[PDB]
Amino acid sequence: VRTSTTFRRPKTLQLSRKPKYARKSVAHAPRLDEYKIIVNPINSESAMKKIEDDNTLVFHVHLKANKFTIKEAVRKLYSVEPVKINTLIRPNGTKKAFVKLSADADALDVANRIGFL
């Protein structure tokens, strides 16, 4: 007994993939980790003034790092909590990140501890 003039195809059981082997012998290591995110800090005169004025570190950062991965990499590499991240792709095709540190920490001591001053 059909009350609709259309015939819709019935639903069938759709088994999920249960492979007999793994297509990859070993899963790849995380290809974008903290050390690959941060390449090296920028130490130009403009970068130094941002350190001493805006409490902002300036880093040469990987292209595929977003503001979230930059924040975690900085927190893991330097144990400092950033309050803001601003990124730009420099005319030479390299990402530069302005990492504004929290008011509790100063960029000067962080810079000396890194050693790039």
Binding site: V1, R2, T3, T5, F7
Partner: protein, 229 residues
């Protein structure tokens, strides 16, 4: 009787309350494979079927079919597992040093397979032939009633190649042939043969000249009935 249970009848006339859900089966846009099945059945009902093909539309009756299948199920062939146990039992018998002939009795089973049954009919070794009515392509069995008639082999056209398959442990079987039965069932086969012969072989001459088909649909039949009236 609660007075609040007031009747609210719905009029379903043209322009009245919304039409109720009715059976719309005859108007459903069925899938193409469904339409192809049903319209193929209609062409076979409409078109003038040649007698060699139309003879397959008249099959064995229900009572004789049940009687035939009762006899057949006593002579189903050995299954794979039963063959394996019998084969192993013969192996230990040979290992024990016994004749392979006397260990196992002579088989008594239905003969199946189109080519094997055809050879049996041509050699007059088959005493009964059961031809499936729904073999596709039909040419695989169109010649069989004539071949059975020339060699005088009693033949019946039975429904459901699937039923023949279940007898011989397969899915479908084109034909079944009974060559030898035990003396207990010799009377039963003879009674079946007589009924099958009187039903099919005697009527073979008349059926060879009876073209099938020619049935028109209900709508045209009713329209022509009105014209005649």
């Amino acid at each position: 009787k609660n007075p609040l249970f007031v009747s609210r009848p719905r009029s379903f006339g043209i322009g009245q309350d919304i039409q109720p859900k009715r059976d719309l089966s005859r108007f459903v846009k069925w899938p193409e494979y469904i339409r192809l099945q049903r319209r193929r059945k209609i062409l076979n009902l409409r078109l003038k079927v040649p007698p060699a093909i139309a003879q397959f539309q008249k099959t064995l009756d229900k009572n004789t079919a049940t009687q035939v299948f009762k006899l057949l199920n006593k002579y189903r062939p050995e299954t794979a597992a039963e063959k394996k146990q019998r084969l192993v039992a013969e192996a230990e018998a040979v290992a024990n040093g016994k004749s392979a002939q006397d260990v196992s009795k002579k088989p008594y089973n239905v003969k199946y397979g189109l080519n094997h049954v055809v050879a049996l009919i041509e050699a007059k070794k088959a005493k009964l032939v059961l031809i499936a009515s729904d073999v596709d392509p039909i040419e695989l069995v169109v010649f069989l009633p004539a071949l059975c008639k020339k060699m005088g082999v009693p033949y019946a056209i039975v429904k459901n190649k699937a039923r023949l398959g279940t007898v011989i442990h397969q899915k479908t079987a084109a034909v079944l042939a009974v060559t030898e039965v035990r003396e207990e069932d010799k009377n039963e086969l003879a009674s079946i043969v007589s009924a099958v012969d009187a039903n099919f072989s005697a009527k073979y001459d008349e059926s060879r000249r009876k073209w099938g088909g020619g049935i028109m649909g209900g709508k045209t039949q009713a329209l022509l009935a009105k014209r005649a009236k």
